Structure formats: structure tokens, C-alpha cells
Design an enzyme around this catalytic site. Structure first.
Site, short mmCIF file in Angstrom:
data_model
loop_
_atom_site.label_atom_id
_atom_site.label_comp_id
_atom_site.label_asym_id
_atom_site.label_seq_id
_atom_site.Cartn_x
_atom_site.Cartn_y
_atom_site.Cartn_z
CG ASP A 1 -2.28 0.62 1.00
OD1 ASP A 1 -2.28 1.85 0.79
OD2 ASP A 1 -3.34 -0.05 1.09
CG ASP A 2 -0.88 4.58 2.00
OD1 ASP A 2 -0.58 3.81 2.95
OD2 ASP A 2 -1.95 5.23 1.97
CG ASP B 1 -2.83 12.86 0.57
OD1 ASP B 1 -2.16 13.81 1.03
OD2 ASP B 1 -3.81 13.00 -0.19
CG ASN B 2 0.90 8.88 1.43
OD1 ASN B 2 0.60 8.25 0.41
ND2 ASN B 2 1.39 10.10 1.40
CG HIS C 1 -5.82 2.47 2.58
ND1 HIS C 1 -5.56 1.17 2.18
CD2 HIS C 1 -7.16 2.55 2.77
CE1 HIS C 1 -6.70 0.51 2.11
NE2 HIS C 1 -7.69 1.32 2.46
CB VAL D 1 -0.29 -4.60 19.99
CG1 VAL D 1 -0.03 -5.13 21.38
CG2 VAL D 1 0.97 -4.69 19.13
CB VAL E 1 -3.19 1.32 22.14
CG1 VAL E 1 -3.16 2.14 20.87
CG2 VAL E 1 -2.24 1.92 23.20
CG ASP F 1 -11.86 -0.18 -8.52
OD1 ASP F 1 -11.53 -1.12 -9.27
OD2 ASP F 1 -11.68 -0.21 -7.27
CB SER G 1 -13.34 -8.30 -5.47
OG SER G 1 -14.30 -7.71 -4.63
CG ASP H 1 -14.98 -1.92 -12.47
OD1 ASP H 1 -14.96 -2.54 -13.54
OD2 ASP H 1 -13.93 -1.53 -11.90
CB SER I 1 -9.61 -0.88 -0.05
OG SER I 1 -10.72 0.02 0.00
#
Ligand SMILES: O=C(NCC1CCN(Cc2cc(CN3CCC(C4CCNCC4)CC3)cc(-c3cc(Cl)cc(Cl)c3)c2)CC1)C(F)(F)F
Ligand SMILES: *[C@@H]1O[C@H](CO)[C@@H](O)[C@H](O)[C@H]1NC(C)=O
Ligand SMILES: [Ca+2]
Ligand SMILES: [Ca+2]
Ligand SMILES: [Ca+2]
Ligand SMILES: [Cl-]
Ligand code: NA
Ligand code: NA
Ligand code: NA
Ligand code: NA
Length: 472
Positions: free
Chosen positions: A44-45, A82-83, A85, A96, A101, A149, A184, A192, A259
């Protein structure tokens, strides 16, 4: 067994439910399976490796930064976050437990890393270096994304990435094969159809769709025959969402989409692999087919296949059931080596026009070492021209009568480029005997006078010739 004490664990309804609308993960934890010894990587990011709910399980050996070409997958911090995900996905797998937490991962004692590979130009080489990261250390790869997509793209792994899939499943994990878990798609509102995404449509990926809390097909879901199973995710604003770790050492209750389903599946697969570390990549797909549960998932296309299993194009075989997965894994007998039966169907090109049906009776490589009496995946590899691709709907019917939708109409897909040996895949005839008559249907769903030609249809059968169970 003592369930987790984490402050948001009660909000993780898809794990902590007492109403039977959950992934049955507590049952696996109570059998002693929490992911110890298993290694998962999030493609991912990036991953916030110092997150208070990830650091204790973070594994640098499961991580890399392919965008900047360094070992450290820390996300790039921006005003819009943005990053974030990959950090959300990592916590779904392996946050954990019992540390005060946020919540917990499905496999809260597994080791977790991330490949930073989406924050930059995604080339074939980037994909291949990510899929092929440390394949004798990482057991399971989770990928939540693919081609756009937009409901008009047909694309899949190019050469290096496809080679990474075959190297992964063949030599990865000591020869048992990397387990690639895939979402998917999120293209539902664009109509789609996810066999047009060659990553999820691959036999080498274990593909996962979503259900909403109330058991419905979410707005973002894509239907297709390549999907294997389902995990819960988000829905409407009365339905709960996914609760997990977030960027900047925070906790989110609003992680969403298909996702978010693939990482939950990856965690369940981690528990399953702890229960039997000798499972091959194909074994794992067999376990998913046998243990997944349709009950209380609402769809208008549930159909019983030739071995008595219910299947849907929205849900595959249904909701993953972690307790059942780990139970069946423990004494699982390794499946026989994979056979592949190639059947070139057409004797001549066929005009499509308004409708085309191609019928062929096959023996599935009778008399040969690739004789298949027990199907796994089947593909219809099609080469065809057409003037407006998205007006096509394509179905494949097995000898047992199981109708697989290979392609639904895609209204936004105006392409005149057709399909170039595109390997439409179905899981819906798993464990059927593929000998007999197969039927391919291609239809123009529009009133327009569309036109084109089918020039190649290869039916490709994968599977074995032994070990069948009595039909369900
Ligand atoms: O080289 C060639 N094409 C290269 C193409 C490279 C691209 N790819 C498809 C793709 C694209 C993207 C990027 N996103 C960002 C914006 C939005 C839609 C797109 C992300 C992934 C992907 C791949 C892996 Cl492994 C894991 C994960 Cl999480 C995501 C995949 C299709 C092949 C050719 F010349 F041969 F055509
Ligand atoms: C794993 O499975 C293979 C194939 O059945 C078998 O030969 C091997 O002994 C198994 N290994 C372990 C450690 O169980
Ligand atoms: Ca870096
Ligand atoms: Ca926690
Ligand atoms: Ca898609
Ligand atoms: Cl192959
Ligand atoms: Na996608
Ligand atoms: Na797949
Ligand atoms: Na049937
Ligand atoms: Na038959």
C-alpha cells in the site's frame, strides 16, 4: 480464554459480536490461534511502524519502500493524511492486543510489515518488486487496490508482475507458495465488473469482497465470478465501519470499502496458517471454499453449484469463518499437484452480432496426466473485437449447469479495443467434474446495432483427479 481488553475492541463488531454477524474470530483465538509465527505484509502507501498499536508486532523483514528504494516504509506525512491507508490495513491484520490502545488485529500476535509502493508511479517493476518482497520470510501479502475502478478499464499484471505471481506461488514460502490476498474492487457505483481487474481475476490471488453490517451488498462492491469469499466492511451511515490504527498514532472508526475487507481476510488466513504451516497456496483456497458461510448475506444471485455449495458473484462462497478455517486446517491433507487442461474451442471465428452461443463437449484431458475430474479455477480466455465493449455480457455454463457471469455490462466502457486473450476466471465450479458440455454466451445488452467477432476461445481447466468430498 480471555477476550481482549482494548478500549475499542467492543466497537470491532465484526470480531466481538455476540449476534452471529461476525467473522467468528473469537472461536479461533479460543482454540489457541492468534497468528504467532506468521508474517503478513501490506502492499500500500506505507506503514507507520512506530504506531503504538503496531510497533510491538512490526517486522522490518516484511517491509520495504519501493517508491523511494529504501528499506523503511514509513508513510509520507501530508496535511490531507493521504498516505494513511496502509497503516489502517496493518492494524486490521495485526494491531497489538491487551495494551490499552485502539482495538486488536485479527491475528494480533502475527508480525506485520508494509511495502510502500503506491506513493509514486506504479510501474510493472514496482509491482513485481513488491509482490516478490522477501518471499521466504513473508507468508501472506495483502493488497487492497488494482487498476482504476472507473468501470471502463481492462488491465492486469504486466510481464514482471505476472512472473512475480508465478515465482511466488511456485517457490515462495519454501515451495508452498506465497498467499496473495486481494480486494475485488471499489467500483460498484461505476458498475464495474471485477473480472476486468487482472489482479483479483488471477487464480494466484485469494479474492475478497464485502458485506455491510446488516448483511447487504455495499454500494462500492463489484460482482464477478473470480471472487472467492467475503468479509464485513462499511455500508450506509446507520451501519458501523472498520475500527483500526490510523496515521499519526491515532485510532479510526471509519475505515471503509472492499479495500478494508482484504486485510481482515489476510488476518484470518494468518490464523489458519498458524493452525497448519504446511498449507499450500491452493490448500488455502480450498479451505476458504469449504468453510465460508452464505447465511444472512443478502443477494439476488445465490445459486447452488454442482457440488451443492451456494455461490454468489457478490460474495463468492460467503463470509469467512475463522473458527471453521482453523479447525479444518489442522488435519487437512495437502491437495494433489495442480493439473492444467487446455482446450482450444473454436474451429473458425464467430460473428458476435446481437448474441452468440458457443457449445462444446470436452473430455477434460481424458487419458492424459492433466486429466481433471475435480475442478479448481476455470478460465475462458477470449480474444474478440467489438465496437463498444461495455455493451457485452458474457456467461460460461459448466457441464453441471453452473452459470458463471464472466462479464456484466459496463455502461461506462466505450472501448473499441475488445479483449485480447483475456482470461476471465470463475471459482463457482470449484470441485465440479468439468467433463461434458460447456456453453459460452456473449450478448449485446444494448439496443444498438453493435458488431464484432470472437476469434479465440481457450477453455483452461485447473484442478486434480482425486480427493473429492460427498456433495454438500
Ligand atoms: O507495463 C505495463 N503496464 C504497467 C501497469 C502498471 C499499473 N497496473 C495497475 C495498477 C495500478 C495501480 C495504481 N493506481 C493508482 C491510481 C488509481 C488507479 C491506479 C496500482 C496497482 C497495484 C498493484 C499491486 Cl501489485 C498492488 C497494489 Cl496494492 C496495487 C496496479 C497495470 C500494469 C504495460 F506496458 F505492459 F502495459
Ligand atoms: C507437508 O506436506 C507434504 C506434502 O503432503 C509432505 O510431504 C510433508 O511431509 C509435509 N510436511 C510437514 C512438516 O508436515
Ligand atoms: Ca522510505
Ligand atoms: Ca490494541
Ligand atoms: Ca474494479
Ligand atoms: Cl499456468
Ligand atoms: Na480496485
Ligand atoms: Na483471485
Ligand atoms: Na445448480
Ligand atoms: Na460431465
Amino acid at each position: 480464554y480471555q477476550e481482549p481488553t482494548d478500549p475499542k475492541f467492543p466497537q470491532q463488531w465484526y470480531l466481538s459480536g455476540v449476534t452471529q454477524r461476525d467473522l467468528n474470530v473469537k472461536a479461533a483465538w479460543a482454540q489457541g490461534y492468534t497468528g504467532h509465527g506468521i508474517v503478513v505484509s501490506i502492499l500500500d502507501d506505507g506503514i507507520e511502524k512506530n504506531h503504538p498499536d503496531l510497533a510491538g508486532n512490526y517486522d522490518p523483514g516484511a517491509s520495504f519502500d519501493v517508491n523511494d528504494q529504501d528499506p523503511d516504509p514509513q508513510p509520507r506525512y501530508t496535511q490531507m493524511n493521504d498516505n494513511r491507508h496502509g497503516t489502517r490495513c496493518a492494524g486490521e491484520v495485526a494491531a497489538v492486543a491487551n495494551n490499552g490502545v485502539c482495538g486488536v488485529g485479527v491475528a494480533y500476535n502475527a508480525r506485520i510489515g508494509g511495502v510502500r509502493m503506491l506513493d509514486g508511479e506504479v510501474t510493472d517493476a514496482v509491482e513485481a518488486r513488491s509482490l516478490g518482497l522477501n518471499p521466504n520470510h513473508i507468508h501472506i501479502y495483502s493488497a487492497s487496490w488494482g487498476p482504476e475502478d472507473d468501470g471502463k478499464t481492462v488491465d492486469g499484471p504486466a510481464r514482471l508482475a505476472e512472473e512475480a505471481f508465478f515465482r511466488g506461488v511456485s517457490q515462495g514460502r519454501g515451495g508452498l507458495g506465497s498467499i496473495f490476498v486481494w480486494a475485488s474492487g471499489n467500483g460498484g457505483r461505476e458498475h464495474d465488473s471485477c473480472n476486468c481487474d487482472g489482479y483479483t481475476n488471477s487464480i494466484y490471488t485469494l479474492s475478497i469482497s464485502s458485506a455491510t453490517q446488516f448483511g447487504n451488498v455495499p454500494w462500492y462492491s463489484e460482482a464477478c465470478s473470480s471472487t472467492l469469499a467475503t468479509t464485513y466492511s462499511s455500508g450506509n451511515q446507520n451501519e458501523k465501519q472498520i475500527v483500526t490504527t490510523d496515521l499519526r498514532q491515532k485510532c479510526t472508526e471509519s475505515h471503509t470499502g472492499t479495500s478494508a475487507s482484504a486485510p481482515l481476510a489476510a488476518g484470518i488466513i494468518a490464523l489458519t496458517l498458524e493452525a497448519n504451516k504446511n498449507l499450500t497456496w491452493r490448500d488455502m483456497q480450498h479451505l476458504v471454499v469449504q468453510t465460508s458461510k452464505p447465511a444472512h448475506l443478502n443477494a439476488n444471485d445465490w445459486a447452488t453449484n454442482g457440488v451443492g455449495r451456494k455461490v454468489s458473484h457478490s460474495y463468492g462462497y460467503g463470509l469467512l469463518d475463522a473458527g471453521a478455517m482453523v479447525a479444518l486446517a489442522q488435519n487437512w491433507t495437502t491437495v494433489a499437484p495442480q493439473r492444467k487442461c487446455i482446450i482450444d474451442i473454436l474451429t473458425e471465428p464467430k460473428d458476435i452480432g446481437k448474441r452468440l452461443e458457443v457449445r462444446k463437449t470436452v473430455t477434460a484431458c481424458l487419458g492424459e496426466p492433466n486429466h481433471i475430474t475435480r475442478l479448481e479455477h476455470a478460465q475462458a480466455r477470449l480474444t474478440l473485437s467489438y465496437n463498444r465493449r461495455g455493451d457485452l455480457a458474457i456467461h460460461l455454463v459448466s457441464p453441471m449447469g453452473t452459470r458463471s457471469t464472466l462479464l456484466a455490462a459496463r455502461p461506462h466502457d466505450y472501448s473499441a479495443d475488445g479483449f485480447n486473450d483475456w482470461a476471465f476466471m470463475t471459482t463457482h465450479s470449484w470441485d465440479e467434474d468439468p467433463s461434458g458440455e460447456w456453453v459460452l454466451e456473449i450478448e449485446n445488452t444494448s439496443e444498438a446495432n453493435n458488431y464484432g467477432t470472437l476469434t479465440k476461445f481457450t477453455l483452461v481447466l485447473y484442478g486434480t483427479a482425486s480427493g473429492s468430498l460427498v456433495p454438500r
